[PDB]
């Protein structure tokens, strides 16, 4: 499955990130992180056109909120990023 | 429920936005969140009229004392944003 | 009882400030805070008048040797914030 | 066996770091850090010809939607420094 | 016992802050704090003369190598502010 | 045993800091430590000789690739900073 992902700055702008996500296409929150200096990641799954959809509307809606740091779309990650993934799981 | 979000600079901040939030409406504070750099955040769930009444009043109560970085009423909060306020419960 | 706070840039800072609320009135210190960017936060439970004489003076000793980023009194705490100050137990 | 080393700001910039690092070259990704201020690590190791490729390809990926702080590779690690690197072990 | 306190920004100029003051005076190293934003701190305790040229010694000494944010010596601490030194206790 | 520290800007400087140190002379990496805001530090222990070649080369070998925040050499450390030294332990 393809892998979305949105940084933002605070907690807030990610969980509005991720309710956009989730509300714009059949993708799932798989992964929360987040590693200090306030980046707060989101982590959605689903097929690489909704997981494009999910992320492009989550980008536009923290952005009405907050500062989106980084964003990106994954449509095959090799097994091993799965490791980091894995390790923010929720 | 809809959730109400407030997220500051500083735990002091945050207590303040969090005890005005409790103190305009009938909502729970449910989460408490802190991501590093200094933001906080208060989580409160209750009706989206309710919500609304308290986010206003703890921004309004916090940038009194200190700097209010986002605040957020989500009055439909998709399931899987659970997972995310779960982890922040208290 | 009512709730004294006060966040400093650094651990000294705070501990100047916590021993001199202890010091200027009859308050009980309850609560330790750190939540990154270098903010640490004491927290005093008293009456009311004794609680603000001692966030007065802690925040002016404070002052001399550090930064203090916020001070608050709250003479009546609402029973939800409760639940982030017994987080901060100490 | 060699040791490649990308850190960026930010988790996404080193998820894409680490994901173009095993596209491009026959490297294993056995170590991934997080020292605050945002830095984020990830550790690969292989041949020092696949090791290289990987970092290269790497810190040009990450670059083109993040900060990469610093990038390494270091063809034959010193026993110490597995030390650090199994401080940082992820499965 | 009085209590002898340096904040400096990063490990090595706090552990050759401490080195100063134990090599300076009859004090025993019994806190260490890290309260992020690279703000480690040293605590000593002993005799408030031997505490006092323990500080000065140490602030010196690290302020050789990096940068000395806070120092502070409390000749009678508080019985409370022992609740955050234990916190620290190494 | 002598202390040798380097302390820097990220992980990966750091990590060619310890390489490089262990590489120049007869020293053992004893301790590692980030203190947040990105400060990570390395710790080897061997005779002074010993040290003061890893630490010299190892700044030199860091700086080509990040910034060395701080470096020291403890000849003859005090026996009570070593437990900052243990708590670091790896």
Do not use: F, W
């Not at 799965?82 to 923010?88: F, L, Q, R």
Request: hydrophobic share 50%.
């Amino acid at each position: 499955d393809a892998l979305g992902l949105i940084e933002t700055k605070g907690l807030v702008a990610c969980i509005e990130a991720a309710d956009a996500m989730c509300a714009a296409a059949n993708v799932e929150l798989i992964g929360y992180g987040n590693v200090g200096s306030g980046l707060v990641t989101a982590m959605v799954k689903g097929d690489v056109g909704a997981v494009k959809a999910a992320v492009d509307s989550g980008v536009e809606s923290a952005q009405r909120i907050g500062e989106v740091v980084t964003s990106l779309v994954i449509a095959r990650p090799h097994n091993d990023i799965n490791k980091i993934v894995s390790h923010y799981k929720i």
